[PDB]
């Protein structure tokens, strides 16, 4: 379990370790290293998704490690509440950025191992705090340079709690 402690409340996340093993390991390496501390939800599109895991306040892009291959051929769809990895047009380019689908986004789903079809890999789901997600998705936004859809008031992941102990989200 992973909890994002944001200034709009907690987002509690259950990872799909067996279905996205390398993606979950990469995510938990960034968590362990404090990478997500003081990062923002820098791209917020109501009716679509909210995206973070790349930038600190001031839109400063944090240094990342080597990218991961795309695990999206795992049968998991981009349904409301899922977390998936952001990436460039190259399928195997994801690093630390992720997004939370606020509605089912079928057009993001894997259809084939091709440049056009690989889609976006789901690796976790929100098990508590969708009300927080739904608050974030509605905030006022603007442009900040090459970035559109940037919240006017920063939505900040202040810290991240990773727990391995037993939990009740079963």
> What domains sit in the chain, N to C, each tagged with a CATH number?
2-162 (2.40.100.10)
Order across the sheet with 156-162: list the strands.
Answer: 39-40, 156-162, 2-6, 9-15, 122-128, 82-85, 98-101, 49-52, 43-45
Q: How was this structure determined?
A: X-ray
Question: Closest Cα partner for 80 from 127, 36, 43?
Answer: 127
Resolution (angstroms) equals 1.2
Q: Which residues, 6 or more positions from 60, have their beta carbon under 8 angstroms from its beta carbon?
A: none
Answer positive or negative: Cα dihedral of 48, 42, 86, 11. negative
The rounded distance, in Å, linking the Cα atoms of 63 and 103 is: 30
């Amino acid at each position: 379990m992973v909890t994002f402690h944001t200034n709009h409340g907690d987002i509690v996340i259950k990872t799909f370790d067996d279905k996205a093993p390398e993606t979950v390991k990469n995510f938990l390496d960034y968590c362990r290293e404090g990478f997500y501390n003081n990062t923002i939800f820098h791209r917020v599109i109501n009716g679509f998704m909210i995206q973070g895991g790349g930038f600190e306040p001031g839109m400063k892009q944090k240094a990342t490690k080597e990218p991961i291959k795309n695990e999206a051929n795992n049968g998991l769809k981009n349904t409301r509440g899922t977390l998936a990895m952001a990436r460039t047009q190259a399928p195997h380019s994801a690093t630390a950025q992720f997004f939370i689908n606020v509605v089912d986004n079928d057009f993001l789903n894997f259809s084939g191992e091709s440049l056009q079809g690989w889609g976006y890999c789901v690796f976790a789901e929100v098990v508590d705090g969708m009300d927080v997600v739904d608050k974030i998705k509605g905030v006022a936004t603007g442009r900040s340079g090459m970035h559109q859809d940037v919240p006017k008031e920063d939505v900040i992941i202040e810290s991240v709690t990773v727990s391995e102990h037993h939990h009740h989200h079963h």
